[PDB]
Design a protein around this nucleic acid. Structure first.
Ligand code: MG
Ligand code: MG
Ligand code: MG
Ligand code: MG
Ligand code: MG
Ligand code: MG
Ligand code: MG
Ligand code: MG
Ligand code: MG
Ligand code: MG
Ligand code: MG
Ligand code: MG
Ligand code: MG
Ligand code: MG
Ligand code: MG
Ligand code: MG
Ligand code: MG
Ligand code: MG
Ligand code: MG
Ligand code: MG
Ligand code: MG
Ligand code: MG
Ligand code: MG
Ligand code: MG
Ligand code: MG
Ligand code: MG
Ligand code: MG
Ligand code: MG
Ligand code: MG
Ligand code: MG
Ligand code: MG
Ligand code: MG
Ligand code: MG
Ligand code: MG
Ligand code: MG
Ligand code: MG
Ligand code: MG
Lengths: 144, 67, 185, 60
RNA sequence: GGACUUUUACUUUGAAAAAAUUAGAGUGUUCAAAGCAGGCGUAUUGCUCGAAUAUAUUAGCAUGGAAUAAUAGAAUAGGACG
RNA sequence: GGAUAGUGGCCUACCAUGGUUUCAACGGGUAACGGGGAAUAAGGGUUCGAUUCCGGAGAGGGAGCCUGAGAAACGGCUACCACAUCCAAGGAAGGCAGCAGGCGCGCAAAUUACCCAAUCCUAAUUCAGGGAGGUAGUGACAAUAAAUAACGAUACAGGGCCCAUUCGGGUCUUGUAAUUGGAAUGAGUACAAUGUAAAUACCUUAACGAGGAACAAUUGGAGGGCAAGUCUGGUGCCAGCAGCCGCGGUAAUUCCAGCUCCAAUAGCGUAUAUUAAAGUUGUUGCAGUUAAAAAGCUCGUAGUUGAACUUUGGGCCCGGUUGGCCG
């Protein structure tokens, strides 16, 4: 039968083996170690608001050749520092260090996105006015 | 229009078995109005700080003007 | 602390989002029966899929089972009563085989058109919604109504609402306020 | 890799593409009328079958 | 009423069983999500259908079964009936 | 024996040495209140339940206790700890995890409004009271129905089709049209009645209320997965795109726009989680010669598993439920 005890009273052995082998499951492992709470700049949440320290010209990976505009952010709830991307041509003129940006996941389950090395977060708002809106013309950035 | 109706055995029979707001809608009862609900509550709570009638306390607080 | 007001959703959504053949056959229905959504098609397929599901679960039982007979006849009789199921093929092995157009066929959208009265599936739309044609004296402004096979003989224009005869109406009576004001005194 | 590369060009192309303002155009029918407009355009009076059915051919 | 009983697993049926939820019947909330309504007349002094059914699985209780799988018995006879 | 309303190591005294555990005791963790239930739809499962009902626990943290049928009560008291308020400096007073509202915290959540009319509850009680509860406000949490147009005329044009020696356009409408045509309706607005405790809305309904300047639908995408351009302009490995594969270094099917087009549509994107796809957790149902994987070898306890055989076969009777040929 190759392994698995087929006996009618072998349930304990069958449960415990499953329990044991779930740990090789990458997601089951993180979910029980609470990795999102322990590791992971965001406290396990969807977004996290922080504060801009400096504006960085992260140079793209190969075979691309560019300078990807990013901001080092010190998350409010954490103090953890995180370098995050500012998408959408322009938009590095909106940020202006010491400002209050709202970070969000990049959409790769951790795992920095593209040619951008070690950037697992992107900006969604600045000064509470929705980066997208500033880009088009819909809203204007607040007083200071 | 589908509604509901009551017809009483007398008008005296209505003015006792009817809700007091319906007799308002009709005229068979004058809308005796009172202070706001949260005014009466405050009146009660103000009243709860005086043990006794109270006008005896008005004499001792008249002694305040002396001292 | 109130009994929770229950609810449910009336539509499903296709998994493959860009199946071009599926999109074709959908527009055809929306274009034939005068719909505005793919959801108006999604809803019917959702309702139809549950109907099949009861039928599927019933067939796996033994014939003339208590639950199978009671609930099976109800399902057959209901579909018949609204005019979706044929009189002869009336034993639920055909309700399994029912398709979407059969349900689309009974909407007050279509009977209002099929029985003249609109000359267009879309004129039917605008008429129904605009406080026009009724069932009894009961006006109906829902293009999806499921004319129930015997209310089919009562789809006339409204007692109000010209095209059934009550008044011209504000747009027409405005002309009667410029024909008698400019020509006369 | 380097992190402190230049930022002077932030917004370069977007700020130097010539703005050709939009053109006023017939208003499109918002609702069932659009699904109808798709029906008669796609299936009723079909335009061309030049091998296959092209859905946005400019210079064919 | 008296006198005694090898142990179990499994399976059958049934009692015991909250409502909302789910599945589901009836009912034309104008449709529908819902709701638990309502439908008939002499609509000038009432007639009347409802407010079902199902799942409720481990355990415990009750009962039919006696295949399958365990257990116990008579070997220094300290055996069995009267 | 004491104590309790009462059983009981509940406590005490005396005596004994017991009680649990690989069939996982004991200890640790929980970003743990339990359950009815929720999400995901072949099935088997996976994941979730602070939160409308039930049960429990609490009232800043502990402990103590008065009253009483019932409390170890906190909108009761007493003490300590932590808060924290008022003062004439002597002292005094506070406990929103009630309803609102404020600060803080954050990605994250509404009014310091009306009423006991209903639903029910309490009292000495038909009456009083009830931020229980109902009403409204805020409210794209989720859920339902489904407006943004409908129909003619006409101007070339086409396809039908009868004839075709050869003009063609004639009456069956396919509709693309840069002039036209009268019809229709609520979105709104608003007498009035209706609704309501009083109001608001809804359902009714006078008077108003549609032609492009509108009562003007959006949100994404248009190289592949993946539905929709190899159009024009711009930039020139820069700026940016790009879930993933990959685009951009001067004719860019991916960037920035115009045009046009697709998809869903009063909704649409993104982030995070989870479920399906996943037979990549495999009981159903995985794989392990070489891709990830058989302990160097044998013994071996716990665990799982374990040959065959013990009333079979034949006979009679009773009465049930479908289905037939018949009615
Ligand atoms: Mg390992
Ligand atoms: Mg740095
Ligand atoms: Mg009061
Ligand atoms: Mg049972
Ligand atoms: Mg003792
Ligand atoms: Mg000892
Ligand atoms: Mg273990
Ligand atoms: Mg906890
Ligand atoms: Mg839990
Ligand atoms: Mg799984
Ligand atoms: Mg709970
Ligand atoms: Mg919590
Ligand atoms: Mg308590
Ligand atoms: Mg607190
Ligand atoms: Mg206390
Ligand atoms: Mg309090
Ligand atoms: Mg209390
Ligand atoms: Mg509060
Ligand atoms: Mg919110
Ligand atoms: Mg209240
Ligand atoms: Mg609009
Ligand atoms: Mg207009
Ligand atoms: Mg667009
Ligand atoms: Mg483009
Ligand atoms: Mg394609
Ligand atoms: Mg690569
Ligand atoms: Mg050039
Ligand atoms: Mg070019
Ligand atoms: Mg180009
Ligand atoms: Mg979607
Ligand atoms: Mg099995
Ligand atoms: Mg494998
Ligand atoms: Mg190798
Ligand atoms: Mg190997
Ligand atoms: Mg080996
Ligand atoms: Mg070993
Ligand atoms: Mg055996």
């Amino acid at each position: 039968g190759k392994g698995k005890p087929r006996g009618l009273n072998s349930a304990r052995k069958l449960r415990v083996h499953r329990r044991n082998n779930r740990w090789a499951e990458n997601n089951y492992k993180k979910r029980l170690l609470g990795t999102a709470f322990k590791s992971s700049p965001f406290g396990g949440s969807s977004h996290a608001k922080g504060i801009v320290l400096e504006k960085l010209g992260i140079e793209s990976k190969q075979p691309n050749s560019a300078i990807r505009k990013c901001v080092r952010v010190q998350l409010i709830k954490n103090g953890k520092k995180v370098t995050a991307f500012v998408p959408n041509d322009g938009c590095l003129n909106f940020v202006d260090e010491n400002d209050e940006v709202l970070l969000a996941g990049f959409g790769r389950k951790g795992k920095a996105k593209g040619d951008i090395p070690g950037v697992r977060f992107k900006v969604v708002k600045v000064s509470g006015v929705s980066l997208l809106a500033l880009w088009k013309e819909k809203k204007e950035k607040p007083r200071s | 229009s589908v509604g509901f109706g009551l017809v009483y055995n007398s008008v005296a029979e209505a003015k006792k078995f009817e809700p007091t707001y319906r007799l308002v809608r009709y005229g068979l009862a004058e809308k005796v109005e009172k202070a706001s609900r949260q005014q009466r509550k405050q009146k009660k709570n103000r009243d709860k700080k005086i043990f006794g009638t109270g006008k005896r306390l008005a004499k001792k607080v008249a002694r305040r003007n002396a001292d | 602390p109130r009994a929770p007001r229950t609810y449910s959703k009336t539509y499903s959504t296709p998994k493959r989002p860009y199946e071009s053949s599926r999109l074709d056959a959908e527009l055809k229905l929306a274009g034939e029966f005068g719909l505005k959504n793919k959801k108006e098609i999604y809803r019917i397929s959702f309702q139809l899929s549950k109907i099949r599901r009861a039928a599927r679960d019933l067939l796996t039982r033994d014939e003339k089972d208590p639950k199978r007979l009671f609930e099976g006849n109800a399902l057959i009789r209901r579909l018949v009563r609204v005019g979706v199921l044929s009189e002869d093929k009336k034993k639920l092995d055909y309700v399994l085989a029912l398709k979407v157009e059969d349900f689309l066929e009974r909407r007050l959208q279509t009977q209002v058109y099929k029985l003249g009265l609109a000359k267009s599936v879309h004129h039917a739309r605008v008429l129904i919604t605009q406080r026009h044609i009724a069932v009894g004296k009961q006006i109906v402004n829902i293009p999806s109504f499921m004319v129930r096979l015997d209310s089919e003989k009562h789809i006339d224009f409204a007692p109000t609402s010209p095209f059934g005869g009550a008044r011209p109406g504000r747009v027409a009576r405005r002309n009667a306020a410029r024909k008698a004001e400019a020509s006369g005194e | 890799a380097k992190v402190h590369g230049s930022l002077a060009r932030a917004g370069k192309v977007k700020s130097q593409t010539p703005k050709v303002e939009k053109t006023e155009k017939p208003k499109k029918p918002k609702g069932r009328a659009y699904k109808r407009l798709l029906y008669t355009r796609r299936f009723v009076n079909v335009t061309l079958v030049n091998g296959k059915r092209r859905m946005n051919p400019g210079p064919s």
